[PDB]
Automatic annotation (TrEMBL):
Protein name: Large ribosomal subunit protein uL6
Lineage: Bacteria, Pseudomonadati, Bacteroidota, Flavobacteriia, Flavobacteriales
Entry keywords, A to Z: Ribonucleoprotein, Ribosomal protein, RNA-binding, rRNA-binding
GO biological process: cytoplasmic translation
CC terms in the record's Gene Ontology section: cytosolic large ribosomal subunit
Native organism: Flavobacterium johnsoniae (Cytophaga johnsonae)
Amino acid sequence: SRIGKSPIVIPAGVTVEVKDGIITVKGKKGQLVQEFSDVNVTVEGDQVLVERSSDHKDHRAKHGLFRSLISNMVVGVSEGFTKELELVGVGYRAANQGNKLDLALGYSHNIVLEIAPEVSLETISEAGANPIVKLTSFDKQLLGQVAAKIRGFRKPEPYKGKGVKFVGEVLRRKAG
RNA sequence: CACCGCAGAGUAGCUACGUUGGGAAGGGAUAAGCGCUGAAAGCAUAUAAGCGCGAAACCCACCACAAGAUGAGAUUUCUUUU
């Protein structure tokens, strides 16, 4: 309710259209579609007004859900989100061959990932510091899913700290 | 004839104590559990909408049988009642 009654004013340069259930947003970084079912969303030209009909414990939440989804899609395709992973540990290596990441962890093999063409991929492993991988995309959901399935290759241990973690994001540590 | 009288072997067959093979590989939906985005509840939250993983368990998959499956299927050919 409170988060749904706010405007979704557009950073002019990106358009938004509505269809029979599907809303599309076209900016400078590709079209993004979404499916709404129990909300009335209307684009005036500058702001996007999303409202509900009844307060039945479900539409009251779907209102804010779809408002936040549309706002994210906009602040995405307009600008785009980005995240940073950091490999910590001895013998850990990361390399980039375009849209193809190559990770060498303490396993008995390597891991090559053919990231989808909708996500950028940069690496910094300059001299001795921890290798930092950086992803950037307009779809925050897909970006987070890729970051999660990259982090899941090696969970951060609490004793030392070695593992694929984000920059910052202090970890829970123990004594051992 | 005497346990096939006894004793030494023995092809075919039947067996193991012998030989060969098998429980391999790959999908779907999941349990405990692990996450993405996100409100209700301006925060937070793996969930309420929607998504990604997840076991010798379940449905395929491997082998055998199977249209009396009365819901009695299909195809090719022959003859059309001595």
